[PDB]
Design a protein around this nucleic acid. Structure first.
Length: 44
DNA sequence: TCCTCAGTCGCGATCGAACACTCGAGCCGAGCAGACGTGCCTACG
């Protein structure tokens, strides 16, 4: 979680692109929301 | 060049739900002494 916070908007965006997250969530460009989704995607 | 601002992480902090221990109330079985009767046997007329 702290590691995901360090990940920064640029690399978490690229990770959400890699997992196949839809472009709306990538688009909102909210780092805090993006990390919560990426943590959920990793948990899945 | 800034300049605070919104969304979220880690940790103490208390709180509700559950779980382990205790303790007595009550019932049940065993055990023992005894009474309330039937049958089975002897000293006295």
């Amino acid at each position: 979680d702290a590691d995901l916070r360090r990940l920064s908007l640029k690399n978490a965006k690229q990770l959400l692109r890699k997992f196949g997250v839809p472009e709306e969530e990538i688009k909102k460009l909210s780092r805090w929301e993006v990390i919560d989704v990426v943590r959920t995607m990793s948990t899945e």
